[PDB]
Design a protein around this ligand. Structure first.
Ligand SMILES: O=C(Cc1ccc(O)cc1)Nc1ncc(-c2ccc(O)cc2)nc1Cc1ccccc1
Ligand SMILES: [Ca+2]
Ligand SMILES: [Ca+2]
Ligand SMILES: [Ca+2]
Length: 187
C-alpha cells in the first residue's frame, strides 16, 4: 500500500498511456478521448455485451472524473498525473480497509467481461482475453506468467480481488510484482 510517485518509471508509465489515449496527439487529454480509447475500443476488443459495455463506461467515467477529467476539458500531462497521485492516495486508504473503490468497481466490470464460461472465476483459458487489451498480444509463456503473478493463492483461477490487486499495483503503486502485467509494450 505504498506509492512510488517520483519514480521515473511510474511517470513514464502514465505518460505512455496519456500519449496513447490522446487521440488527436495534441498533448492534452479529455474524458472524451479516454472514453473512446479506454472504454469503447476496449469493450469492442473483448466482445462485451451492450450491458457490460455501458457498465464499463460508467466505471471509466467515474474513475477518470476521480483523476480530475471531464468531457470537453483539455488537461495537460502534469495535471493529469497529479490527478492520479491524488486518487491513488485516497483510494489506497479505502483499499486498506476493504472499503469500496473506483478501481475495484472498474475491476468488477472488466472481470464480468473476462468471465465469459460464467463461473465467478477467471481461468487460464479466459485470461487470454487480457492480452487483447494492449497492442501486443502475449506469447503463451507470458500469458501463463502474468496469470501466475495474479494467482496469489495458486488456486488455478483468479477472483476479483486478485485481478484488482494487480491492476492497482500496476497503476497506483508501481508494485514490482505487477511488472510485466501488460507486456513490454506498456512500460
Ligand atoms: O487494463 C484495463 C482493463 C482492466 C483490467 C483489470 C482491471 O482490474 C481493471 C481494468 N484497462 C485500463 N486500465 C488502465 C488504463 C490507464 C492507466 C493509466 C493511465 O494514465 C490511463 C489509463 N487504461 C486502460 C485501458 C487500456 C488501454 C490500452 C492499454 C492498456 C489499458
Ligand atoms: Ca487530445
Ligand atoms: Ca470463468
Ligand atoms: Ca486464485
Amino acid at each position: 500500500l505504498k506509492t512510488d510517485f517520483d519514480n521515473p518509471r511510474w511517470i513514464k508509465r502514465h505518460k505512455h498511456m496519456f500519449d496513447f489515449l490522446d487521440i488527436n496527439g495534441n498533448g492534452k487529454i479529455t474524458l472524451d478521448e479516454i472514453v473512446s480509447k479506454a472504454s469503447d475500443d476496449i469493450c469492442a476488443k473483448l466482445e462485451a455485451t451492450p450491458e457490460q459495455t455501458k457498465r464499463h463506461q460508467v466505471c471509466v467515467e467515474a474513475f477518470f472524473r476521480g483523476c480530475g477529467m471531464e468531457y470537453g476539458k483539455e488537461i495537460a500531462f502534469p495535471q493529469f498525473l497529479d490527478g492520479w497521485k491524488q486518487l491513488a492516495t485516497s483510494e489506497l486508504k479505502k483499499w486498506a480497509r476493504n472499503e469500496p473503490t473506483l478501481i475495484r468497481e472498474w475491476g468488477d466490470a472488466v472481470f464480468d467481461i473476462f468471465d465469459k464460461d460464467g463461473s465467478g472465476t477467471i481461468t487460464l483459458d479466459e485470461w487470454k482475453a487480457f492480452g487483447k487489451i494492449s497492442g501486443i498480444s502475449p506469447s503463451q509463456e507470458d500469458c501463463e506468467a502474468t496469470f501466475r503473478h495474479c494467482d496469489l493463492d495458486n488456486s488455478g483461477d483468479l477472483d476479483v480481488d486478485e485481478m484488482t490487486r494487480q491492476h492497482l499495483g500496476f497503476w497506483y503503486t508501481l508494485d514490482p510484482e505487477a511488472d510485466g502485467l501488460y507486456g513490454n509494450g506498456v512500460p
